[PDB]
Structures are given as structure tokens and as C-alpha cells.
Design a protein around this ligand. Structure first.
Ligand SMILES: O=C(O)c1ccccc1/C=N/OCc1ccccc1C(F)(F)F
Ligand SMILES: O=C(O)c1ccccc1/C=N/OCc1ccccc1C(F)(F)F
Lengths: 115, 116
């Protein structure tokens, strides 16, 4: 599993469950092509988005639909979604974890790249 | 000044100086149209992007060119940029500050929204 997404809720101190996540890849014509998507599990995690052979070098965008999450909890949010745009680089055997921590008016995101 | 941007560097403990910032507004046809741009000052701040009259209700995107910033320091960072997408003035006109804290493999952003 070369690409994982983990989403946390900073208000409730819990995994952010049932959050929609969309992944896009930049095509040579500078357009976002849909690549993978899913909803976070009860652990706030989304696995199995792609395979090693499909996950090639390129520019990727991970979109986290935070607005619908906060609305379902009855909280007025600021952002439309959280976006994370990065370059996947094949230097060696690498796995990418995109982690996001969510509050109604703020979010943080980090990339953990391991073997 | 209804829209300000402030950018900090978490590695050096300083304002992030000379960072390019681009603001887009979602147009009628679902396309992102250019709205304003600038560079952060020696204080890490960017003011004067727009006026109250031109900053109407809409969906806005603030793109902070973090990659160019880290590269100029010799760091190959993870993100291409930091993007912040939000609806503005949906409840009437407000003053927005978009703040971002940058590290090579991480960033955080928060909005401070005040009523004049
Ligand atoms: O990521 C991971 O492999 C991970 C896996 C399992 C459980 C927790 C984590 C890490 N979750 O990190 C949350 C986060 C995300 C973005 C910025 C800052 C944070 C902080 F809360 F850690 F500060
Ligand atoms: O910067 C400033 O003087 C500033 C100016 C106007 C409004 C708010 C602020 C502060 N903003 O707080 C930045 C910060 C601090 C600690 C963690 C994370 C952040 C982040 F917002 F950058 F993400």
C-alpha cells in the first residue's frame, strides 16, 4: 500500500470518520484527472487507494471534504475542503502517508514517507 | 483591508519573506479566475490584495507558493504549494486573515475572521 490517508478531529480528539477523500493526478495537459477516492474508516484511515504499479511519479492532489464533516456535526466551518498537492518521487521503495488534523477554522497536514 | 495573508517559517523561527501568494475566485462557469497576487513582506505579511468593494461573496482560493520558498533555501519540500479554499462574505462583509505555518513536509493554516 503506497498511499494512505489519515484524518483526525481536533475538536473531539478522535479519528475523523466517514470523511470523503478524493485523489487526483496532474495530466500532461495541466488538468486534474480523478485517480482514487473513498471514505475514512472508523480509525480515520483510508487504505487501498492505489497499487505500486499505478502510483507513478507525478503531481498528486488529495482533497479532503472537511466542510461536509463539520456540517454533519453541526459546526460552522471555514474551509470548503482541505487540499494537499505534492510530487511523488521515485528515489527508492517509498510509502506515503498523508495525515491531516482538522478544526473548524484550521487544519494541518503532514507527509510521512517511509520504506 | 478585508483580506490579509501571514506566513511563518517553522524551521527558522521567522516570518516567511518573499513568498508568492495568488488569490483566485470561482467564476460563474466553475472555473478559477485570477483575483489578486503579491509577495509577503519582511514581516511575512501581505496586505492590500483587494478592496471592500471588489471582495464580494464567493468561493476563493489562496495559493501560497511554498515550494519556491523552500527551494530558495536549499530544501526539496513535499508540497507543491499550500492551498486554502473558502467561502467569503456569505454572512455579510468581514475581514479575513489567512495564516500559514510552513515546514518542509508539513504546513498548518488557520483563518481569523473579524467584523469591522
Ligand atoms: O500520521 C500517522 O502516521 C498516524 C497514524 C496513526 C495515528 C496517528 C497518526 C498521526 N497523526 O498526526 C496528526 C497530525 C496530522 C497533521 C498535522 C499534525 C498532526 C499532529 F496531531 F500529529 F500534530
Ligand atoms: O501570524 C500572525 O502574527 C497573525 C496575524 C494575524 C492574525 C493571526 C496571526 C497568527 N496566526 O498564527 C500563526 C500560527 C501560530 C501557531 C501555530 C500555527 C499557526 C498558523 F496559523 F500559521 F497555522
Amino acid at each position: 500500500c503506497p498511499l494512505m490517508v489519515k484524518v483526525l478531529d481536533a475538536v473531539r480528539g478522535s479519528p475523523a470518520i466517514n470523511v470523503a477523500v478524493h485523489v487526483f493526478r496532474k495530466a500532461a495537459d495541466d488538468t486534474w484527472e480523478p485517480f482514487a477516492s473513498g471514505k475514512t474508516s472508523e480509525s480515520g484511515e483510508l487504505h487501498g487507494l492505489t497499487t505500486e504499479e499505478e502510483f507513478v511519479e507525478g503531481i498528486y492532489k488529495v482533497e479532503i471534504d472537511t466542510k461536509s464533516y463539520w456540517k454533519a456535526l453541526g459546526i460552522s466551518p471555514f474551509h470548503e475542503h482541505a487540499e494537499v498537492v505534492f510530487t511523488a518521487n521515485d528515489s527508492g521503495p517509498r510509502r506515503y502517508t498523508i495525515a491531516a488534523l482538522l478544526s473548524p477554522y484550521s487544519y494541518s497536514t503532514t507527509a510521512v514517507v517511509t520504506n
